[PDB]
Amino acid sequence: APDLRGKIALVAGATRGAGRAIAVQLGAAGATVYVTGRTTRERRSEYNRSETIEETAELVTEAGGTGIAVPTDHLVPEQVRALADRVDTEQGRLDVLVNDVWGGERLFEFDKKVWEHDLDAGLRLMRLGVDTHAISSHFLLPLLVRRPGGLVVEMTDGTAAYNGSHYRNSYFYDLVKNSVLRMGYVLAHELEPYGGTAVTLTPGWMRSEMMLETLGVTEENWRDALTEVPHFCISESPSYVGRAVAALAGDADVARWNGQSVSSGQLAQEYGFTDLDGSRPDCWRYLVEVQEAGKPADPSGYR
Amino acid sequence: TPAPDLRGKIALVAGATRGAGRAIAVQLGAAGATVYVTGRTTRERRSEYNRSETIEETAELVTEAGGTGIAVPTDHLVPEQVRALADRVDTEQGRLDVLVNDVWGGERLFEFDKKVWEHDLDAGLRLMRLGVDTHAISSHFLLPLLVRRPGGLVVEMTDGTAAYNGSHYRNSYFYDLVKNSVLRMGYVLAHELEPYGGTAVTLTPGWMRSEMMLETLGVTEENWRDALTEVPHFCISESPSYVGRAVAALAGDADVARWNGQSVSSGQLAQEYGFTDLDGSRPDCWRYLVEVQEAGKPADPSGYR
Ligand SMILES: NC(=O)c1ccc[n+]([C@@H]2O[C@H](COP(=O)([O-])OP(=O)(O)OC[C@H]3O[C@@H](n4cnc5c(N)ncnc54)[C@H](OP(=O)(O)O)[C@@H]3O)[C@@H](O)[C@H]2O)c1
Numbered sequence: 001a002p003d004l005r006g007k008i009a010l011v012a013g014a015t016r017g018a019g020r021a022i023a024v025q026l027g028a029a030g031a032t033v034y035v036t037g038r039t040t041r042e043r044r045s046e047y048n049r050s051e052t053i054e055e056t057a058e059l060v061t062e063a064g065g066t067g068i069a070v071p072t073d074h075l076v077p078e079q080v081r082a083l084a085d086r087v088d089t090e091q092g093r094l095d096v097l098v099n100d101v102w103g104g105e106r107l108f109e110f111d112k113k114v115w116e117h118d119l120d121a122g123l124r125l126m127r128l129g130v131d132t133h134a135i136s137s138h139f140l141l142p143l144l145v146r147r148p149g150g151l152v153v154e155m156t157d158g159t160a161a162y163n164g165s166h167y168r169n170s171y172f173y174d175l176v177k178n179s180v181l182r183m184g185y186v187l188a189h190e191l192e193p194y195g196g197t198a199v200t201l202t203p204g205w206m207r208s209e210m211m212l213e214t215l216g217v218t219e220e221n222w223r224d225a226l227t228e229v230p231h232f233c234i235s236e237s238p239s240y241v242g243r244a245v246a247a248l249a250g251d252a253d254v255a256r257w258n259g260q261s262v263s264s265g266q267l268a269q270e271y272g273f274t275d276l277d278g279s280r281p282d283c284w285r286y287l288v289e290v291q292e293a294g295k296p297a298d299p300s301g302y303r
Numbered sequence: 304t305p306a307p308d309l310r311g312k313i314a315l316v317a318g319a320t321r322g323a324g325r326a327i328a329v330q331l332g333a334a335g336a337t338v339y340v341t342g343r344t345t346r347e348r349r350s351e352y353n354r355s356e357t358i359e360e361t362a363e364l365v366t367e368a369g370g371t372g373i374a375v376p377t378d379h380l381v382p383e384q385v386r387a388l389a390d391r392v393d394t395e396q397g398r399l400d401v402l403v404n405d406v407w408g409g410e411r412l413f414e415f416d417k418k419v420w421e422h423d424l425d426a427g428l429r430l431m432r433l434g435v436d437t438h439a440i441s442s443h444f445l446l447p448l449l450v451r452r453p454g455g456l457v458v459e460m461t462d463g464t465a466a467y468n469g470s471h472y473r474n475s476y477f478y479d480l481v482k483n484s485v486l487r488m489g490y491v492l493a494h495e496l497e498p499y500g501g502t503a504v505t506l507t508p509g510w511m512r513s514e515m516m517l518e519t520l521g522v523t524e525e526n527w528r529d530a531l532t533e534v535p536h537f538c539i540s541e542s543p544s545y546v547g548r549a550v551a552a553l554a555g556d557a558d559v560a561r562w563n564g565q566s567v568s569s570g571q572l573a574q575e576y577g578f579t580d581l582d583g584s585r586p587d588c589w590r591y592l593v594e595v596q597e598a599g600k601p602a603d604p605s606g607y608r
């Protein structure tokens with residue numbers, strides 16, 4: 001298991017989903033983790049959900065690290081500048097930056113062409129999914145490149161290999177996920193002279209809070225949903241991609257990944273971690289070799 | 304090779320005041336097309352670019368070249384104006400054969416060789432909005448008319464090929480993200496258009512002798528090789544009309560669907576279709592950049608134009 005004691009991490013967009021679980025797994029490895037998001041105990045966010053950023057910070061501490069909640073709208077440069085100033089003030093360093101901010105799960109429309117998709121929702125989802133990462137990198141990378149060994153993880157949906165041959169959901173969704181892949185390549189070029197590393201990371205099919213609610217199940221009985229969604233047998237908990245980030249952050253030779261697109265399932269094979277249940281789902285190979293091949297849902301050999 | 308015959312075709316070049324946009328519109332007009340040309344700069348008000356070329360002037364050049372240019376001043380960041388533009392084309396023509404998403408507007412906003420934390424942030428966010436959202440809004444409102452019958456063509460204008468950009472960081476963070484998003488737009492739109500018999504490609508010019516570029520170098524088109532002492536690798540450059548002829552060749556290709564989803568360059572298409580630049584040459588910018596300039600060889604256009 002990675003030892004991240006003494007490390008300073010920041011997960012931008014950590015209220016729920018992968019962001020929360022990445023922050024928690026970094027804390028479970030001993031890191032101090034700044035966690036940002038809009039939903040507080042006082043105010044709900046555009047998502048209109050009940051998970052709060054303060055709750056994430058407490059879960060990071062409970063897990064064995066230190067969670068510091070900083071409510072932040074990552075579309076507001078002044079707030080992200082203050083966030084960078086705070087980390088410098090309190091810690092003088094930043095080892096790991098995870099640009100997780102997405103916020104578009106309610107805005108994209110599946111199987112609508114660009115002229116059928118609601119336009120305002122599509123433009124909004126691209127701004128949330130792209131500009132937040134640009135703003136975060138703009139203000140937080142100076143601290144990260146102050147000394148060698150920094151790591152940036154850009155969070156997307158899909159690998160370069162999968163997305164390179166698959167249209168992803170609809171026009172706006174697809175442009176975001178492929179821009180975040182490009183961000184990993186671009187930041188790898190900018191960080192390498194400083195001894196910094198950038199990767200783009202995707203989870204598999206995540207059993208997020210939002211996903212489990214849609215399926216009407218809890219984590220403890222998630223396989224109850226398999227009659228309704230048989231290919232959900234490849235799914236993983238959000239902690240799996242969290243352990244992938246922790247494994248990268250703990251890798252003394254993480255620069256071997258610079259610029260690459262990686263997946264949680266690929267990194268589980270590489271580093272040997274498992275999901276909470278001991279399995280190692282390999283979503284993107286499963287999607288190609290089983291589901292898109294027309295075969296019946298069957299997880300054998302893929303987790 | 305003989306010039307494409309686009310008589311009877313309806314085209315729209317979004318962002319056609321100057322540069323590639325103007326030249327694409329004029330070369331479509333020279334092939335006989337009716338061309339709607341849009342942009343913010345009019346004879347009464349200058350645009351964010353603060354330049355003197357106007358969208359009315361482009362429309363007149365389209366007509367002079369042998370087509371019909373219809374200027375529609377439009378801010379492509381304003382959905383209501385782009386909706387009206389689409390309604391107008393439907394009203395006047397009932398069809399749209401060729402859509403060229405040329406809108407860039409970022410030439411003065413990107414910063415060469417600044418890291419993302421050094422680049423001015425507001426300018427970076429602005430050029431991404433101008434370079435990406437304008438294309439999304441344009442496709443959203445104009446593609447319904449285009450897919451009404453088979454044979455429509457959409458050209459997404461970017462900088463670089465998929466092959467070149469896949470292995471090259473392009474200028475700086477924000478610039479790079481735009482050019483690579485527009486590459487992805489061609490792939491995405493090809494998927495959405497194919498069931499309708501529509502085709503999408505992403506096209507890049509080479510090193511263009513645009514109005515802005517020639518001013519930066521202190522030369523006119525008639526004596527552009529005067530700049531070679533200061534910028535030797537400018538020997539690979541092409542006029543904006545070259546990429547205009549590339550669009551006209553795609554628009555005239557009965558089998559243009561063979562390109563669906565692909566990234567293409569003006570130099571690649573000149574070899575494919577046989578057109579030339581105005582001076583009779585066929586510059587091959589992206590092969591030259593890799594095989595001559597980046598290999599450390601002295602500037603020498605032999606074999607590349
Ligand atoms: N169900 C899923 O979430 C799911 C499933 C499969 C794959 N993925 C992919 O995995 C990646 C990570 O997604 P995720 O699960 O972490 O998605 P997410 O929950 O949409 O994003 C993480 C958090 O970022 C915060 N955020 C959004 N906009 C913000 C802003 N302007 N300022 C500050 N914070 C903001 C949101 O919390 P606040 O509302 O509190 O700000 C949000 O809950 C995404 O690329 C996604 O496509 C997600």
Ligand SMILES: NC(=O)c1ccc[n+]([C@@H]2O[C@H](COP(=O)([O-])OP(=O)(O)OC[C@H]3O[C@@H](n4cnc5c(N)ncnc54)[C@H](OP(=O)(O)O)[C@@H]3O)[C@@H](O)[C@H]2O)c1
Nearest residue numbers: 318320322323324342343344350352378379407408462511
């Ligand atoms: N050597 C080169 O210059 C070169 C080389 C390779 C690739 N490329 C690429 O080729 C592509 C096309 O280039 P270009 O020369 O046509 O660039 P451009 O002149 O920046 O774009 C064409 C016109 O679009 C208009 N426009 C911008 N924003 C607008 C908005 N919000 N609403 C309406 N119209 C708007 C502008 O006219 P108004 O100001 O009147 O609106 C602009 O002059 C660009 O992506 C460029 O990067 C260029």
